[PDB]
Symmetry: D3
Subunit: 134 residues, 6 copies
């Protein structure tokens, strides 16, 4: 029981996901009251780098040259929605890169806050848009 990858213009993919935590934690992330530092900046950077490493992590993904990567945060009362937008010019889509960016930003957020809220959840990681193209 094994595996095999697939074979071979401008593309875009958007993924999102949610960190669910306490109102205290969300507020510390926003105002930067955490002892470990700025969670949003650290998570943004981690996710951006994780996008580029997708083929390192996910065995059957191809190495693709990404042309731009954005990590955005929408802060609510109890949660933070992470949106990752990835662009490329290659022979295949870039949703995997977007998803991994989302996942690693979320893991990083969690790392920054785990001493304050160890029960924090990472939820609803999904593709929002993909450009064969919907």
């Amino acid at each position: 029981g094994a595996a095999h990858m697939v074979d071979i213009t401008k593309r875009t993919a958007v993924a999102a996901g949610i960190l669910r935590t306490s109102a205290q934690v969300v507020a510390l992330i926003s105002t930067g009251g955490l002892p470990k530092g700025d969670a949003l900046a650290t998570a943004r950077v981690a996710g951006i780098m994780a996008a580029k490493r997708t083929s390192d992590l996910i065995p059957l993904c191809h190495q693709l040259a990404l042309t731009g990567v954005d990590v955005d945060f929408t802060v609510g009362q109890l949660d933070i929605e992470i949106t990752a937008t990835v662009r490329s010019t290659d022979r295949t889509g870039v949703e995997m890169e977007a998803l991994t960016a989302v996942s690693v930003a979320a893991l990083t957020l969690y790392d920054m806050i785990k001493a304050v809220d160890p029960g924090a959840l990472i939820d609803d990681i999904r593709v929002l848009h993909k450009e064969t193209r919907r």
Copy 2:
């Protein structure tokens, strides 16, 4: 604007952490898994291996994570009707807890599952990634 926590004045103990997560997919996808009929191959074996390797790569991915000596890593699957539950168990003799590597393994295993199934069910989503247990802490 970040400070790694200094673990220098902390003793090494034998630790274990367990994390879980869930891929929400289709009955068809579950079907193709049990039959071994996925286009890309054995999703479960591939994702187990990806989750194990990622556990080790934790400190490379997560900026403020310390480099920890892992003494063991398991990734288990429970396949339901529509869902695939993922459980990662990580063991280490070191200076801080290993819940990050457990979460990373679950996380990369889920991403890898999705890579294997996205052609049959691109609407699948990754849910409920969380710490179950640290050793006493239990959800």
Copy 3:
């Protein structure tokens, strides 16, 4: 005494290599009786990933975007032949990627079985086909 790399369509390279071990070990690999798990699946995945990492490992190799990578096994009585087929579209050949896939699959197989057969050998790693093109 130093070094320097070379400068700059559709391409394919095939490499093979052989793990030589005991009849007991070959049989455990096939039927999956090993305590560490499925050797073939683990080795296939390791080799596929190693192909993508070739430029990480071999100092003077270029970073190439591979378009497909297959790892195949032919099981005999005493040995396992590993065949790696790599495809790409780039300015240079892909035999190094094929060879490293072969090598790392073989190292992985060995890792899976070393407690059962520590004298197991990795033999006859070679290029079978390269596409300037023979």
Copy 4:
């Protein structure tokens, strides 16, 4: 407070930098009298590999397929000038790759000699040439 990368023919970038050390150390590097081995060969290889890893290291850099990478050394009485020449065909310039090659060669040189000259300095890391193109 966060970040975001930029979007998207033949290119070249040259960077240099200087290791400043003792006359004794410079001479050992040249004649290869160091216990840890050949410093120039080790540094050349480290820098060449570091060029390829630029996007791994520098968060907002893009993954670019480099087409050639040269690391050269000019040895003086008290110092060693490291010159890195990087070539590519991509949508953006390659000076970051050149700079990182310079930096990691210099760090490696320092690693090779730190037991002999711990006060050794890495100085004047800069872009010499970039090809929008000057």
Copy 5:
């Protein structure tokens, strides 16, 4: 033609190393940093994170560097009139000094600063990367 030094017959002690370096830039660049007006974003936060991660990747980059367990990593900036000083502090409980990781962090943080500012000041340069302190050794 190289030999990694054998640290096998050496005891583990609690160690700290400090390294520094300097980015020579423009008053305009300093201005855009204090105002938060750089095109690419927060240079300081980005470079701090890059320096921390690189500290951990030291043995991957530098061929004869041993793999060391880092217990803590700080990257600090002092912004002057025209210059940005970088200081990395590394702590470890291990068999050899941690000055390489400190230098690597300073080094990658400087490269990352330059990446953030090169569009406003491509003539900027990276200067005076050096060991400040090892713990007794002091410059």
Copy 6:
């Protein structure tokens, strides 16, 4: 479908492993090596450095390999008439044997040799990669 072996209930000892391998090439290639006339440069130095670095990257490449603290790594060559023998010696103070890193080093050094010589002799092959010694185990 894989389980990393748990080394948690195992003590740390001082260990050494030796592995070997052979590149089967041409008299011409041996000639160009002794004269320093290879197009790509110093094959031996390049491959030694590649073998050392790969030894450290073992647990990144081999899914079920544990992350081990290596205290020393040597790569030696014996150049014969037509062949180049490679020997890797790895030392570590840890919980499991270091034969994988020794084999990986030999392996990547051979691949790197081949990269340096494939333009003169593309028919060269890599042979007889094996464990020689673990410390008592001896082939």
